Ligand binder design. Structure first.
Ligand SMILES: Cc1[nH]c(C(=O)Nc2nc3c(OCc4ccccc4)cc(C(=O)O)cc3s2)c(Cl)c1Cl
Ligand SMILES: [Cl-]
Length: 191
């Protein structure tokens, strides 16, 4: 089970272009689409209706949704929490130098961090909450994306606007916090 996980990460890092199209600027932006697509699926299942994408200092990406939260129940097949199985099978996690998740579920905040898809510690209870949803924060691996790891605000804006237009009823917000002195936000919500 666990051995099959490591080979999966190795495979994605060995031929990243086969999984995200390219290691150019295009492939870097794809990382955001892959995570946002998971939030959109949770909205289409009837659970979520708000997605926030933040470009943080040093081109971290934070994606937050108000869905049910990725499940944390032990996956009888792997003996690992479901969220760990799901994120260790993620292309984005494989192609990130660092990735962390916060799940709000069962009135609890759970946290796990990864490097190149490898968990750095067991899923941990870190707090309490009266909300549900998922926070993903990731830093693209510069060893993979050798051209640029800098996000283009207008590229992300055009695609987020498109996703809000195609998926009516979902509020999707993009915020650029890289320059703390000039913060830019665009928020889209069709019908
Ligand atoms: C930013 C973000 N959000 C999500 C996300 O919310 N995905 C979810 N998948 C799921 C989900 O997927 C299927 C599942 C997987 C393992 C164990 C039970 C169900 C189930 C349930 C549920 O049963 O309550 C809830 C969620 S929420 C993901 Cl994945 C990412 Cl990345
Ligand atoms: Cl759960």
């Amino acid at each position: 089970g666990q051995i099959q996980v490591l080979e999966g990460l190795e495979a994605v890092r060995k031929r990243p272009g086969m999984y995200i199209g390219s290691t150019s600027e295009r492939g870097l932006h794809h990382l955001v689409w892959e995570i946002v697509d998971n939030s959109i699926d949770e909205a289409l299942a009837g659970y979520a209706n708000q997605i926030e994408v933040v470009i943080e200092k040093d081109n971290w990406i934070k994606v937050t949704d108000n869905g049910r939260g990725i499940p944390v129940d032990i996956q009888e097949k792997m003996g690992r929490p479901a969220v760990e199985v799901i994120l260790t099978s993620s292309v984005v996690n494989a192609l990130s130098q660092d990735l962390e998740v916060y799940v709000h579920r069962n009135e609890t905040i759970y946290h796990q961090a990864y490097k190149k898809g490898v968990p750095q510690f067991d899923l941990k209870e870190v707090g309490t909450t009266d909300k549900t949803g998922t926070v993903i924060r990731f830093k693209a691996d510069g060893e993979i994306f050798t051209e640029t790891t800098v996000y283009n605000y207008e590229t992300l804006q055009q695609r987020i606007r498109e996703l809000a237009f195609l998926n009516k009823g979902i509020q999707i917000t993009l915020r650029d916090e890289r320059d703390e002195e000039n913060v830019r936000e665009d928020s889209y919500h069709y019908e």
